[PDB]
């Protein structure tokens, strides 16, 4: 009806853990523990002879700005906003907001809209390999879109699955089966 970004909203309790886990493992491994920004993650990423140091909270803050500028000043504003958001709402709520607003390509905002556009299903009906595919998109939706870059999409999906394996969110068995899907 109105608001493409407001198409479908789904509560966190109806979002599969594989989905939540895929995004966390891929975009912000220490999400459940940091306070809006991850100093250690910024250092881990720094000392790399590719890695992003921003958190899920920071990605959310980034989209709360009407304009799109990547000036260092904007980066600071986004971080301060993330910090305040973290003091106001708990992790599950922040995760909920993030998952429902994230642009996942093909005009789909939020995991529910993405599930429909890419798999013709509801997010709660997604399999592990399908969840991993959605988590691969935030990096660059157009570059990894499965509709016209299925090669890169598949490659990044399996990378997400590997991240999930390393974080302990899925077992070796689940991993072997999913990367072959």
Binding site residues, ligand CPS, CB under 6 A: 37, 42, 52-54, 75-76, 79-80, 83
Q: Name residues contacting a copy of itself, limited to 4-23 (CB under 8 A).
A: 5-6, 9, 11
Bridge partners (DSSP) listed for residue 1 = none
Annotated catalytic sites, by residue? 27
* Alpha helix (H) residue ranges in the chain: 17-27, 39-46, 56-62, 72-88, 91-101, 111-119, 128-136, 141-144, 150-167, 172-179
Which structure tokens are listed for 19? 């989905």
Closer to ligand CPS at the Cβ: 40 or 125?
Answer: 40
Nearest distance in Å: CB 115, a copy of itself: 19
Residue 64 contacts a copy of itself per CB under 8 A: yes
Binding of a copy of itself by 180 (CB under 8 A):
no
Least separation in angstroms between residue 94's CB and a copy of itself is 10
Q: Which pair of structure tokens corresponds to residue 33?
A: 């523990």
Binding test (CB under 8 A) with a copy of itself, winner from 85, 115, 132, 135: 85
Looking at the Cβ atoms of 141 and 177, the one nearer to ligand CPS is 141
Cβ atoms of 30 and 40 within 8 Å: the answer is: yes
Among 18, 100, 105, 170, binds a copy of itself (CB under 8 A): 100
What sign does the dihedral 175-101-125-32 (CA atoms) show? positive
What gap in Å lies between CA 181 and CA 179, rounded to an integer? 6
What does the alpha-carbon distance between residue 143 and residue 45 come to, in Å, rounded to a whole number?
Answer: 22
Q: In the complex, which residues of this chain contact a copy of itself (CB under 8 A)?
A: 3, 5-6, 9, 11, 63-67, 80-81, 83-85, 87-90, 93, 97, 100-101
């Amino acid at each position: 009806t109105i608001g493409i970004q407001k198409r479908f909203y789904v509560s966190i309790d109806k979002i599969p853990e594989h989905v939540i886990n895929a995004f966390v493992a891929t975009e912000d491994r220490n999400f459940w523990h940091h306070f809006g920004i991850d100093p250690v993650a910024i250092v881990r990423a720094a000392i790399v002879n590719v890695q992003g140091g921003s958190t899920i909270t920071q990605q959310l803050a980034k989209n709360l700005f009407l304009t799109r500028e990547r000036t260092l000043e904007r980066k600071i504003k986004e971080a301060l906003l993330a910090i305040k958001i973290e003091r106001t709402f708990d992790k599950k709520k922040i995760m909920e907001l993030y998952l429902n607003q994230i642009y996942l390509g093909s005009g789909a905002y939020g995991v529910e809209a993405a599930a429909q556009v890419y798999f013709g299903k509801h997010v709660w009906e997604l399999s592990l390999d399908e969840a991993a595919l959605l988590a691969a998109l935030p990096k660059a939706p157009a570059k990894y879109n499965p509709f016209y870059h299925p090669e890169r999409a598949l490659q990044r999906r399996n990378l997400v699955l590997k991240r999930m394996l390393e974080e302990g969110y899925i077992t070796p068995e689940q991993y072997e089966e999913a990367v072959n899907k």
